[PDB]
Amino acid sequence: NWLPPGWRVEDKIRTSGATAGSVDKYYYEPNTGRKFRSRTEVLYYLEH
DNA sequence: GCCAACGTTGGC
DNA sequence: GCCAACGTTGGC
């Protein structure tokens, strides 16, 4: 994508409820493994 | 207070 | 209706 080196993205499928079958993505910072739950939040972190 | 789970919201 | 960013919230 436009992500830097060592950034991992993970799909998690919603298993239950009305939204079941929906996918949420999560972003992992390379050498810290810190977790962000959107693209707006990650590029903000990288921009500041 | 953190956060995983699932809900809500509005531009498309 | 889809998408996905973001609201909420109860169990830890």
Curated annotation (Swiss-Prot):
Expressed in rosette leaves, buds, flowers, stems, mature seeds and roots. It is found in: Nucleus; Chromosome; Nucleus, Nucleolus. Homodimer and heterodimer with MBD5. Interacts with DDM1 via its MBD domain. Interacts with NTF2, RPS2C, HDA6 and AGO4. This is Methyl-CpG-binding domain-containing protein 6. The methyl-CpG-binding domain (MBD) functions both in binding to methylated DNA and in protein interactions. Transcriptional regulator that binds CpG, CpNpN and CpNpG (N is A, T, or C) islands in promoters regardless the DNA methylation status. Plays probably a role in gene silencing. May associate with histone deacetylase proteins (HDAC). Required for nucleolar dominance that consist in the silencing of rRNA genes inherited from one progenitor in genetic hybrids. Recruited to rRNA genes in a DRM2-dependent manner. Maintains gene silencing by interacting with RNA binding proteins (e.g. NTF2, RPS2C, HDA6 and AGO4) and by regulating DNA methylation status. Residues 1-48 form the MBD domain. Disruption phenotype: Impaired nucleolar dominance. Reduced DNA methylation in some of the targets of RNA-directed DNA methylation (RdDM) and loss of DNA methylation in 180 bp centromeric repeats. It comes from the Eukaryota.
